[PDB]
Amino acid sequence: RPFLCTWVCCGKRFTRSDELQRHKRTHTGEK
Ligand SMILES: [Zn+2]
Prior knowledge:
Elements: E1 3-5, E2 12-14, H1 17-24
Antiparallel strand pairs: 1-2
The structure holds zinc ion.
Residues 5, 7, 10, 12, 23, 27 line the site of zinc ion (ZN).
């Protein structure tokens, strides 16, 4: 399944949900 960070105008695509979540940590999650 193709993943994409739709956070504002970020727009980065991943092939793993663990990777998208990892990336998402840059914007939010544990901040
Ligand atoms: Zn992002």
